[PDB]
Design a protein around this ligand. Structure first.
Ligand SMILES: CNC(=O)C(C)(C)C
Length: 126
């Protein structure tokens, strides 16, 4: 029922890059999803205490959210685009694993994911 530490956003010994694909992931992909009317449940780690979801972190062992992704991107945490794409996919998958099919949150994730897929389809060549 308690919250775990959030995912890290800093790790000085993890090697890092700033690539054109990672730049697109921030300027286009994250910015597009972040501004959406359905972004709000996804802009920060799930607070299982405030939301009264005592089993959330029993089920979701690889938490991820756009607040974390945003900080990772702003702080150049990633080596490659794949790492960041994986973080978005973990976020959507978690939502679909935890929640009931058809729930509001699922529809919200689906709307964000559709946009994510449309933007990733035009990920620039390196
Ligand atoms: C991303 N948030 C969720 O999946 C809830 C469990 C609905 C708070």
């Amino acid at each position: 029922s308690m919250n775990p530490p959030p995912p890290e956003t800093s790790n000085p010994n993890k090697p890092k890059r700033q690539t054109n694909q990672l730049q697109y992931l921030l300027r286009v992909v994250l910015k597009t999803l972040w501004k959406h009317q359905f972004a709000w449940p996804f802009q920060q780690p799930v607070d299982a205490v405030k939301l009264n979801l005592p089993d959330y972190y029993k089920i979701i062992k690889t938490p991820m959210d756009m607040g974390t992704i945003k900080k990772r991107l702003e702080n150049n945490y990633y080596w490659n685009a794949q790492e960041c794409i994986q973080d978005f996919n973990t976020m959507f998958t978690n939502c679909y694993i935890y929640n009931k099919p058809g729930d509001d949150i699922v529809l919200m994730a689906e709307a964000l994911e559709k946009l994510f897929l449309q933007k990733i389809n035009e990920l620039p060549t390196e």
